[PDB]
Structure 1
Amino acid sequence: GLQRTLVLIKPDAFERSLVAEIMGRIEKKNFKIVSMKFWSKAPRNLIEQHYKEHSEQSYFNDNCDFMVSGPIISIVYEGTDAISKIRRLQGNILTPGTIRGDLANDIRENLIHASDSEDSAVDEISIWFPET
């Protein structure tokens, strides 16, 4: 059951030099890069589209400002059950063994985004890779 899912490497990973570390954890779990873009600075409307379901929250504006404060990488990964597996790999800051659990300690600056559903996956892929 192959799926594809959208990942973003966030500006705190560039600042802290953790880009290969995060990418390597997904690589070691046998997921493949199908497409990839580097953005020295992502255009703000792409970020706002990406986070559109969050538009009414108190943190919305501040988080977009963080996301435009440095480089980001967008990646489409392919593999069995990709969506849910990469989501678990991302985890959270309370859970040792995961990316966030081992390397992050903040509510905003948490290194990585992964799609959490099939629909969000489909939509997020179309935002960052509209040539399809």
Structure 2
Amino acid sequence: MSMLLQKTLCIVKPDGVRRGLIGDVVSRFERVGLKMVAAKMLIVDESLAKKHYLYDDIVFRHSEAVWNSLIKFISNSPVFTFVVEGVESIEVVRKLCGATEPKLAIPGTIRGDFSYHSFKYSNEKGFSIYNVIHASANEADAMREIPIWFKDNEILNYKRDDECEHYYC
């Protein structure tokens, strides 16, 4: 009904997966009242990694080296990918993940509570930052990212028992 209802793509990254953090992550979203409407576990291949992190954009905004480092992090590695639905969910999910850099991420956030290392370190070592989770940055990103990971028939429609407390009935 309302235009404020959004879906956002979330990925528990390989660092997160290998550390056994998928549950901890999902609970955070379930706990505030956000609804999981799709989920899959997969090994990401190069091709899919290249659709998710677009060369043209990442190179425009950062560098080819940053893009290489994102691709190497995620390619041929396991991820847990899911879609979260709710009132202004893109913004709220950004709020819950915390700052991109775990060193700066505030305690209480996913990144703040589960990771700590710094961009300065990751740049020195020539790796991407390992910051547990990806979340669609904004509306245009979510509209692009979701269909890359999910077919339309993998987006589920149902009611959480607490729906009336979040959407009103």
Residue matched to 1:7: 10
Q: Which residue of 2 aligns with 1:51?
A: 53
Contact 1:11 1:69 (C-alpha < 8 Å) held by counterparts: no
In 2, Cα distance between equivalents of 1:54 and 1:45 = 16
Of 94, 104, 109, which residue of structure 2 is paired with 1:87? 94
The count of residues paired between Structure 1 and Structure 2 equals 131
Amino acid at match of 2:110: I
Deviation at 1:55, TM superposition (A): 3.9
Alignment partner, residue 120 of structure 1: 141
Cα deviation, residue 89, structure 1: 0.5
Secondary structure (helix, strand or coil) at the match of 2:130 reads coil
Q: Which moved more, 1:86-95 or 1:52-61?
A: 52-61
Within the alignment, does 1:105 sit opposite 2:107 as a pair?
no
Identify the residue that residue 40 of structure 2 maps to in structure 1.
37
In the alignment, what sits opposite 1:63?
A: 70
Specify the code of the residue in structure 1 equivalent to 2:91: S
Instruction: Could you tell me which runs of 5 or more consecutive residues in structure 1 were left unpaired when the two chains were aligned.
Output: none
Contact 2:22 2:80 survives alignment (8 Å): no
1:33 deviates by 1.2
Instruction: Determine which structure has more spread, i.e. the larger CA radius of gyration.
Output: 2
Question: Which runs of structure 1 show a deviation greater than 4 angstroms over 4 or more consecutive aligned residues?
Answer: none
TM-score normalised over the length of structure 1: 0.91
Instruction: Report the AA paired with residue 70 of structure 1.
Output: S
RMSD: 1.6
Sequence identity percentage: 36
The residue type paired with residue 72 of structure 2 is: D
More RCO (CA 8 Å, sep 6+): 1
Deviation (angstroms), 1:34 = 1.1
Structure (1 or 2) with the greater helix fraction: 2
